[PDB]
Subunit: 173 residues, 4 copies
């Protein structure tokens, strides 16, 4: 632990990849030209509690979709960078816009495009379903899988390492 | 006998939706539609609980036509949507049905479900559920949510009430 | 173990439950009131093969749906019985219509309403995902699960029992 | 795990089955006549990397749908054959239309229609969800299942055999 917690303690921004992280990775099409994407419910409460404890939420995704716009809005995710292959540059751009540093950003991804941003963020996360190279470069690997609570699990970890986890639990107790 | 005694006197069984009746997936498409999946074997269990005289209810923080439909075809008379404070709703039910909290079962999977699982006469959770709800529950299912969790529990309550073998005999 | 083949060798009618057998048990709804159901692709080739060796196929379900009609018609399943509580009566009513005895009927099912039909058919089949009572009265239980190959495997098993499997494989070699 | 690298060394075309390879083999229908098919995100980045290494791509499937077109175009798959059960016929047709030896063709599939093309290609591949006959005929079985990164797995494998794996990764480091 130790190193993980200090990295997580100084986080002001959590920035997410969509496919493989917020969803399990299925790109779903149908015979009328419609697209579908699945998200996990427990991820929703975790993100909410990070917003309310003071952390700014962001999405950086290489694909563009309405489903992502619809989920981000309802979740209180504030910055939505769609159609962006270069994750680092978007993350650096938010850092200058919000007036923080890479060291104050947490980043979670699952594939090669995320690699630099996971490497250069203060706290870089990946998932079991994530590829070999991106996992080698991360400060933490989740126990749960993309679209099955990987985000929630890291939400609770940042909350713990900020001694904010009990405030959150107690509102339901 | 710990679990069987708590369940022996259930007069109403009430349920969370997402994570319980579904595997907790929330599905959206590019034309503004939402989708939810349920498990067939749950329906049979729930219907069997109905027939023995147990009242059924749903209490969920989200809101959808899918939940109305499933509940209608399953004889679920109390459908409470857009409601995150599960314990107030359940107590609201308890009183207006003329029953007690000790005669209530409630199954749930996340923190909004905590207090209701704690205060319900028979509190239930699931493997996929979080640790704080689970620590507070009288029983945990082997099968996951949207995978027989509810059916398992339905069978549990019937056995407790001397009603399982007779339900089985209807299909023999 | 080998009592299994004598049962399988005189099958002229293979009748299937739908949910838990042709599907994994997911009943799917949406906000426009639509319903959806998933089928396994490999089950097709196996029902195609049983139909070719001269076996007549049937579906008995306590549930409606045009999805059943669509899948059934693409596999050439002639007899489709939907909205049926009592499967055993449906099955028997179907044997009288044909020149068939219960002994020449195979039937596969996952839950209690399938119990009598699985028990009285000459070759009753169930699945790892079926309830306990239905499994304890079947003559065979599949390795693969509903909507994941249960049907294909039992299709292969009957073909082997009727000396039609080896000829069937060969056509793809 | 050594015979595989030489077989793959000379591949100038990777051709693919759809159902059971690019998807998990679910065939999805709803009550408005709409068919749905699911794909895997990490496969795309695998395919475009191959295509960028100078390898032509192809699909050969027994079914027909708008989804396969939408996905194939999206991933730069130029040769798309639909409504064809003779996979070995179609592939040969492609090999001679493009002027390439069959020893240079890699082909992946899950079931019996695929078995001849798998066996006769310079690099035939199957997956764990696939049948026994087609598995026993393949040069390589994937660890990852159809619709869950099987295509991505082989994609990287071909790159490693061709000495383009390192250059592919560098672009994200
Ligand atoms: Mg991703
Ligand atoms: Mg829930
Ligand atoms: Mg069934
Ligand atoms: Mg196939």
């Amino acid at each position: 632990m130790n190193e993980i917690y200090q990295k997580a303690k100084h986080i002001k921004l959590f920035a997410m990849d969509v496919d493989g992280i917020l969803s399990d990775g299925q790109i779903i099409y149908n015979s009328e030209g419609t697209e579908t994407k699945a998200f996990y419910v427990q991820d929703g409460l975790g993100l909410q509690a990070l917003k309310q404890s003071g952390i700014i939420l962001a999405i950086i995704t290489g694909r563009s979709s309405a489903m992502v716009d619809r989920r981000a809005k309802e979740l209180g995710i504030s910055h939505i960078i769609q159609g962006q292959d270069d994750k680092l540059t978007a993350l650096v751009g938010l850092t200058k816009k919000l007036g923080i540093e890479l060291s104050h950003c947490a980043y979670i991804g699952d594939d090669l495009p995320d690699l630099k941003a996971v490497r250069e963020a203060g706290f870089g996360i990946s998932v079991p379903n994530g590829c070999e190279q991106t996992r080698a470069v991360s400060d933490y690997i989740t126990t749960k899988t993309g679209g099955n609570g990987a985000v929630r699990e890291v939400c609770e970890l940042i909350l713990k390492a900020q001694n904010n986890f009990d405030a959150f639990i107690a509102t339901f107790q």
